[PDB]
Design a protein around this ligand. Sequence first.
Ligand code: OH
Ligand code: ZN
Ligand code: ZN
Length: 228
Amino acid sequence: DQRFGDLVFRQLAPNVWQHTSYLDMPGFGAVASNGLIVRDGGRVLVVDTAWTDDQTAQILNWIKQEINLPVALAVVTHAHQDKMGGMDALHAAGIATYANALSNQLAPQEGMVAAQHSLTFAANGWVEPATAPNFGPLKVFYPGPGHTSDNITVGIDGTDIAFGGCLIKDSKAKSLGNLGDADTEHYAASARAFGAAFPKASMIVMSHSAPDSRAAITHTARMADKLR
Ligand SMILES: [O-]
Ligand SMILES: [Zn+2]
Ligand SMILES: [Zn+2]
């Protein structure tokens, strides 16, 4: 771990880092949220903001210090604060932003600023390629409704890594966390669909646990079986 102001950065693979930020959540504690930073040749790609604009500006500062290449785009994985709370900071920095069309639709009512561009998805869940131009190694997949109706996931080509966002919890998790906006009927199938989309991914990264094996996926789905 590298502490950088109030955030934490951890290298996961040669061109991939995890960013972590915290929100002191009244009546629960200081909740960590993770996203990703990927170097693709001469540019950087970001998955998820931090909780806040100030924290997200700090992610960009860290990138400037440790990579020193332009951030070409960011993709955010649903319309909750941990994933989209720093959209204004990305826009202030001139970074092109992307989210599920449904996330952009929901953003205002969720208290988020919408991304500039909307991703749409084929019936099988893969992003429609025209809506994710210049995504390089980022392979975006909509697994179905689970943690939220709009949750999306991202594999990183050239690595063993897939990112489940808030859909997936680690293999020792006691619960499925914040289910306030969850789809209880479809959660288990959506978790399994994420696994099936990225079958070779041996490192599963997620919002609220450290990176884990694929047991994160099986355990999450098995817990979600109890929601039905
Ligand atoms: O979330
Ligand atoms: Zn969420
Ligand atoms: Zn979350």
